[PDB]
Nucleic acid binder design. Structure first.
Ligand SMILES: [K+]
Ligand SMILES: [Mg+2]
Ligand SMILES: [Mg+2]
Ligand SMILES: [Mg+2]
Ligand SMILES: [Mg+2]
Ligand SMILES: [Mg+2]
Ligand SMILES: [Mg+2]
Ligand SMILES: [Mg+2]
Ligand SMILES: [Mg+2]
Ligand SMILES: [Mg+2]
Ligand SMILES: [Mg+2]
Ligand SMILES: [Mg+2]
Ligand SMILES: [Mg+2]
Ligand SMILES: [Mg+2]
Ligand SMILES: [Mg+2]
Ligand SMILES: [Mg+2]
Ligand SMILES: [Mg+2]
Ligand SMILES: [Mg+2]
Ligand SMILES: [Mg+2]
Ligand SMILES: [Mg+2]
Ligand SMILES: [Mg+2]
Ligand SMILES: [Mg+2]
Ligand SMILES: [Mg+2]
Ligand SMILES: [Mg+2]
Ligand SMILES: [Mg+2]
Ligand SMILES: [Mg+2]
Ligand SMILES: [Mg+2]
Ligand SMILES: [Mg+2]
Ligand SMILES: [Mg+2]
Ligand SMILES: [Mg+2]
Ligand SMILES: [Mg+2]
Ligand SMILES: [Mg+2]
Ligand SMILES: [Mg+2]
Ligand SMILES: [Mg+2]
Ligand SMILES: [Mg+2]
Ligand SMILES: [Mg+2]
Ligand SMILES: [Mg+2]
Ligand SMILES: [Mg+2]
Ligand SMILES: [Mg+2]
Ligand SMILES: [Mg+2]
Ligand SMILES: [Mg+2]
Ligand SMILES: [Mg+2]
Ligand SMILES: [Mg+2]
Ligand SMILES: [Mg+2]
Ligand SMILES: [Mg+2]
Ligand SMILES: [Mg+2]
Ligand SMILES: [Mg+2]
Ligand SMILES: [Zn+2]
Lengths: 119, 57, 192, 110, 46, 235, 45
RNA sequence: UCUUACUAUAGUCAGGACUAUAAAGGUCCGAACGGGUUAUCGUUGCAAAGAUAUCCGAAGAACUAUGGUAAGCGAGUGAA
RNA sequence: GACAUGAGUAACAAAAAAGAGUUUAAGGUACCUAAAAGGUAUCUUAGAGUCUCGCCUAAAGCUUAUGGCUACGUCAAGUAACGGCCUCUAAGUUUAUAAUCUGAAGAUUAUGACGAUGAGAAAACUUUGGUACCAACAUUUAAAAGUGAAAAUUGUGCAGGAAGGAUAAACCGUACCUAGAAUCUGAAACAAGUAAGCUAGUAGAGAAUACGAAGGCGUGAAUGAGAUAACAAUCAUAAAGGAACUCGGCAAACUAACUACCGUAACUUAGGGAUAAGGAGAGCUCAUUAGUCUCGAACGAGUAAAAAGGAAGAAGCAUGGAAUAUUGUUGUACGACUGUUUAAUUAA
RNA sequence: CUUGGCCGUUAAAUGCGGUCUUGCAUGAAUGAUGUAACGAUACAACAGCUGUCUCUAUGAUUGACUCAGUGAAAUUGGAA
RNA sequence: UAACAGUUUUAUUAACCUCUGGUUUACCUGUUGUUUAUGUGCCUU
């Protein structure tokens, strides 16, 4: 459950390390795995995104428990995302870390193909 | 209050459904025959038996 | 808005309420009878029956659980695991009896009741049933089906039963306890 | 399920008022109950206020049947149903759906 | 509003401030006694 | 913790029946002590003359008693011998117009002070068991348990009659290991001689029976100098 | 006493009159040399 | 006999810490004590100025007690 | 002035708390009994007490003041274990005297008198000016040790710390209450306020914090018994997020105390800043012991001795274990600073 | 006039800080100006923290409600 | 034919606790300080 002012760990090679959620796009309820958000970059890593940039992102794993049809429930130790463009495709080229398997049913194929492991 | 309540309206509030209900759930004690409340013990025989079991036991 | 209450709170705090029930049960096992309010007699009933169940267990956990319910255990534990354990050895539950009575305090007019240990030396239903049978024999009246039903209730699990009952009846008759009683054949003609 | 006397938050979803910023004794209260003289100088009918809640008939529509066991005498329906356990409910074919096939209606009568 | 000005008050100050000798031995005190005597007061002081 | 006794019959070490509950008399519940089997014990580690005389003071209005080793009492005796019996019942000090000597016990031996220090111990211990553990007066005699906490405390202060009875008991051999005995262990034992001086001859009758080793006299040394004449019965 | 210095181990109860009461008839805190004897009964005033 | 100032005679300030001192400081942390910062409650109140928490000073220009002096044409007292 | 209405409504909620037996007196009912009486049971009014539970506790306890519309059998030559009266004086007062000033009233100076919150021989028997002084602070001292007073000794700092007199038992006070349970002030039986001493023990540096032995209390029906809706007050916990709340982080939460621990920036009036910041340690068991202490007989043993002690060990999710001490940092304005103020809406 | 211009801080600055000034209407003991230290003064920012909020929920006590006992008040031209 | 595999989102109203969480003041377990009761309890001849 991501909302305004929530901090997330960006796990793509876009240049961002810590981003703050500014808007939940396409809905009023708090964002979960597979939802689009607008973020503001607060920390970088050392056409990369710099601190203060405003980009769109996709929640790839949350700390709130996410239930599935088969009764299984997944939970991560952090909230993470990957930056995207208004077109919907990723900005980076490689993702380091596990992502939520809920990205499959929300039409995020490109984010999954570059994801090493899914949970 | 904006006005003094009249005699008609205060009597309504005091009497309409505020009558004291008569107690009809009464019966007699099987040991002495005095009037008692239903599903209750006789207060006369209670104290008398309570004292009878205190002297000889 | 929330859930219904599990039990009566009796307008008290958690610690106070617990101590209240322990005192009612401590006084019950000490005197075999207590006269209090009906709501208190009904809350101490569930705790008194659960304490007599511990008396019928053989583990040490039960001996420590009974010690934690009474307030003078060193003085009452021998009676619990002694006289009381032998009394209710063949009775499957229902060791207590609550009987509504008139208000114990007339100031408040609070509904009162008597909590007693069945088959005990101060069983009120055992005595009331004896005074009824004593009146019937002294007045040559036929006992009702409800009197016979109670005669069997207060003599089935008792130690001697009928022998103790007939002795209570004989005592009341010799003491003239039924003197001044109203014959049931004259109840229908009395307006007071 | 009955709820007894319910306030305005539970009975109508009122938001309530603030909690710390100076609010005085009005954290769960309904606030204003209407407009001034220009609106009737009265509380209008249908005004949402505290009151009893629940213990009313409630219908859930379009619930499929997943299991049918005659020995146990149960009919397992998907979703939730109004009331507590042990309460009687009325089950009937959905009104917003087509009736069951004619071959089935006649097979049951047979 | 009124205040509790008699809190901690002592009776040694009452006799010094309003006692009989405080008045018979002064020029203005004699007037007080003579005024209260004319009115018929029993309590002329303290 | 505390352990109260019950008013049951028990044996006595004295030669008399100090109480109606006494079963037997002159019973040896323990072998003789180091000084009991000694013809002349002496004050080994005490001042010269200490123990030859023992004084008893009482409140002439309320009955509170105090035991002393010297001819005078101080504020220590009141703090250390008077327990709390209630509010307004324990005096904050000793008032000279209310406290008077009750009696003085003098032993025949003028250098056997150890005998007196023992008699003093048994007296203070008995008094402690009168103010506390008074099971013999709860339902009998004064019936202190049938009274209010106010009247009860006023009766616990009246220790004068009890104190006189303690003397007749302690001087008769009461107490385990009291030096009023004299065991020869040739085994023959006897009681030591003593003298009790009274300001009021009538006070010596609070004891139902006195031993044969005690002689009674009227007048305590020092009272005649204060112009306090003693009270005699025969006039 | 074996150890006499002030900091020595304290094993005594420093509340001497603990539980003692003349109005409640609590009894004596310890067993005395006159505790197993019947309390002498005087003649009342 | 409230209160402001002054005056006389007295009393009180757990414990710890730093500082040049054993004791030299309108020093430090913090009870008693003395204040009354903030918030809530209360507002026909328990109270015509209270309750709870929080906060400030706490060897000093400190606090407190019993007495005394100064007030009503001109103004007594006033760290105002 | 009487009597209505609101209304038989609010209120009888200091976040201590009650439960079950027993008993005395007087009186009211029912029955036994009709020779009254007495007995049994019950109720009303006014009390008492037992067992259990809880609350207060450097108090809501004990002993005493100021005071008192509570009540009058409260008893003293003096010290131990006592004040007044009486002697002496301070601040001051003075319808005393003298002198002086003054529209009268009066005022002033001196003397006298009066005036405690101070000073007053002896007793467990008794009747000059540092050769100093008895303000503060510190130190030392009744010899087994420790602790708290009294008095004295010595010293320190500047703010430089009274006066006077001497040195055979009268009269007055003495009861009760001390503010959480019937008494003082607050219009009162008010959750406020008021002086002194004592005020168990464990544990601590401590009068902090927690428990609480004794004692008292858990109110004069000025209440009691139920039920546990909304809502209010006072609290407790909380998924994910973490100021998005709001005039404003108001309120709440985080943090916290301790160690003779490590370490600590800019700047600076060189004192500070600073307990900066930021880290480490902690309870239980145990190896080990230079001296002290204990036991046995230099030596041996011992923590049923105080302490020391280690990179030792055990168990648990967790050993600042419960309670007690409310964040850190940064840039400005104003005022140097500690202080003071509109008693009771403004504390700056 | 005015949210003065510029810079920093904010995803967004009528705020805060720095800086330039033609300052309706700054100014030198009605003192001018800059630091250390101090502040329950006022303003702004960061970190942490949290039911302040997203968005409330459950639980506890006391009241609220019912029975018994006692028994007010403001108010009231008269009222179907 | 079988088998296998795939077949919207947002918002809103209401009901409902199977699941995921929150709550748990008479449930179980562990644990600190202190008090009370009961039982027990040192060495040596
Ligand atoms: K003149
Ligand atoms: Mg209630
Ligand atoms: Mg508790
Ligand atoms: Mg229900
Ligand atoms: Mg809300
Ligand atoms: Mg209209
Ligand atoms: Mg209208
Ligand atoms: Mg005024
Ligand atoms: Mg005053
Ligand atoms: Mg007195
Ligand atoms: Mg004054
Ligand atoms: Mg200071
Ligand atoms: Mg509030
Ligand atoms: Mg209000
Ligand atoms: Mg400060
Ligand atoms: Mg401080
Ligand atoms: Mg109304
Ligand atoms: Mg109401
Ligand atoms: Mg009410
Ligand atoms: Mg009667
Ligand atoms: Mg005198
Ligand atoms: Mg004089
Ligand atoms: Mg004086
Ligand atoms: Mg108080
Ligand atoms: Mg009063
Ligand atoms: Mg009061
Ligand atoms: Mg304290
Ligand atoms: Mg009291
Ligand atoms: Mg009570
Ligand atoms: Mg949360
Ligand atoms: Mg969380
Ligand atoms: Mg905002
Ligand atoms: Mg907003
Ligand atoms: Mg705050
Ligand atoms: Mg290790
Ligand atoms: Mg482990
Ligand atoms: Mg200032
Ligand atoms: Mg200041
Ligand atoms: Mg003001
Ligand atoms: Mg002030
Ligand atoms: Mg203010
Ligand atoms: Mg100038
Ligand atoms: Mg009522
Ligand atoms: Mg659920
Ligand atoms: Mg379930
Ligand atoms: Mg649950
Ligand atoms: Mg339990
Ligand atoms: Zn009957």
């Amino acid at each position: 459950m991501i909302q305004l002012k929530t901090m997330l760990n960006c796990i793509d090679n876009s240049g961002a390390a810590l981003v703050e959620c500014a808007m939940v796009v396409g809905q009023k309820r708090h964002a979960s795995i597979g939802d689009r958000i607008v973020v503001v970059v607060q920390k970088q890593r050392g056409t990369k995104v710099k601190r203060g940039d405003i980009r769109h992102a996709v929640v790839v794993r949350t700390k709130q428990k996410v239930q599935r049809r088969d009764g299984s429930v997944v939970r991560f130790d952090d909230n993470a995302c990957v930056l995207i463009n208004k077109a919907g495709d990723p900005i980076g080229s490689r993702i380091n870390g596990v992502v939520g398997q809920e990205l499959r049913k929300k039409k995020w194929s490109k984010i999954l193909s570059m994801a090493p492991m899914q949970a | 209050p904006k006005k003094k309540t009249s005699h008609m309206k205060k009597r309504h509030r005091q009497m309409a459904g505020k009558a004291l209900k008569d107690v009809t759930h009464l019966n007699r004690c099987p040991a002495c025959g005095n009037l008692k409340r239903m599903h209750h013990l006789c207060s006369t025989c209670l104290g008398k038996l309570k004292g009878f079991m205190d002297r000889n036991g | 808005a929330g859930a219904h209450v599990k039990y009566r709170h009796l307008s008290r705090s958690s610690a106070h309420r617990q101590a209240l029930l322990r005192n009612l049960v401590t006084s019950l096992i000490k005197n075999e009878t207590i006269h209090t309010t009906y709501p208190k007699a009904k809350e101490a009933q569930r705790l008194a029956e659960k304490l007599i169940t511990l008396s019928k267990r053989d583990t040490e956990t039960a001996r420590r659980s009974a010690q934690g319910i009474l307030y003078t255990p060193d003085q009452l534990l021998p009676k619990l695991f002694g006289e009381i354990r032998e009394r209710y050895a063949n009775r499957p539950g229902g060791y207590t009896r609550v009987l509504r009575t008139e208000p114990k305090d007339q100031y408040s007019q609070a509904p009162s009741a008597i909590l007693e240990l069945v088959d005990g030396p101060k069983d009120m239903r055992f005595a009331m049933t004896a005074a009824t049978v004593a009146r019937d024999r002294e007045q040559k009246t036929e006992s009702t089906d409800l009197t016979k039903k109670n005669m069997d209730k207060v003599t089935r699990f008792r130690k001697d039963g009928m022998r103790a009952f007939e002795d209570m009846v004989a005592s009341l008759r010799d003491m003239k306890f039924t003197a001044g009683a109203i014959n049931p054949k004259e109840w229908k003609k009395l307006d007071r | 399920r009955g709820m007894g006397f319910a306030g305005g938050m539970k009975r109508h979803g009122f938001a309530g008022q603030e909690a710390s910023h100076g609010n005085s004794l009005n954290h769960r209260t309904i606030g204003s109950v209407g407009g001034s003289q220009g609106s009737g100088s009265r509380v209008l009918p249908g005004k949402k206020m505290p009151g009893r809640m629940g213990a009313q008939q409630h219908t859930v529509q379009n619930l499929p049947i997943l299991m049918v066991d005659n020995e146990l005498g149960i009919v397992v329906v998907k979703g939730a149903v109004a009331g507590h356990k042990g309460a009687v409910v009325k089950v009937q074919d959905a009104v917003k759906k087509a009736p069951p096939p004619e071959e089935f209606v006649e097979a049951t009568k047979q | 509003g009124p205040r509790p000005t008699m809190s901690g008050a002592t009776r040694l100050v009452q006799k010094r401030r309003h006692g009989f000798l405080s008045r018979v031995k002064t020029k203005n005190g004699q007037k007080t006694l003579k005024r209260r005597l004319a009115k018929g007061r029993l309590r002329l002081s303290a | 913790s505390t352990h109260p006794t019950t008013a049951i019959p028990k044996p006595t070490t004295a030669v008399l029946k100090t109480s109606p509950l006494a079963e037997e008399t002159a019973v040896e519940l323990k072998s003789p002590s180091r000084l009991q089997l000694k013809s002349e014990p002496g004050n080994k580690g005490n001042p010269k003359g200490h123990g030859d005389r023992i004084w008893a003071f009482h409140h002439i209005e309320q009955g509170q008693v105090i035991y002393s080793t010297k001819p005078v009492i101080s504020h220590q005796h009141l703090i250390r011998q008077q327990p709390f019996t209630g509010k307004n019942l324990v005096p904050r000090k000793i008032r000279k117009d209310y406290w008077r000597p009750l009696a003085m016990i003098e032993l025949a031996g003028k250098d056997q002070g150890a005998v007196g220090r023992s008699v003093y111990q048994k007296l203070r211990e008995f008094k402690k068991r009168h103010e506390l553990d008074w099971a013999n007066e709860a339902e009998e005699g004064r019936k202190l348990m049938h009274k209010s906490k106010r009247e009860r405390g006023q009766e616990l202060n009246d220790q004068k009659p009890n104190s006189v009875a303690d003397m007749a008991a302690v001087l008769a051999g009461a107490g385990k290991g009291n030096l009023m005995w004299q065991v020869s262990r040739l085994v023959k034992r006897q009681l030591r001689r003593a003298t009790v001086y009274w300001t009021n001859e009538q006070d010596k009758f609070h004891a139902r029976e006195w031993s044969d080793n005690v002689s009674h006299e009227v007048g305590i040394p020092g009272e005649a100098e204060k112009k306090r004449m003693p009270i005699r019965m025969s006039s | 006493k074996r150890h006499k210095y002030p900091t020595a181990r304290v094993t005594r109860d420093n509340s001497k009159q603990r539980g003692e009461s003349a109005l409640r008839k609590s009894g004596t805190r310890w067993k005395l040399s006159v505790s197993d004897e019947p309390l002498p009964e005087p003649v009342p005033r």
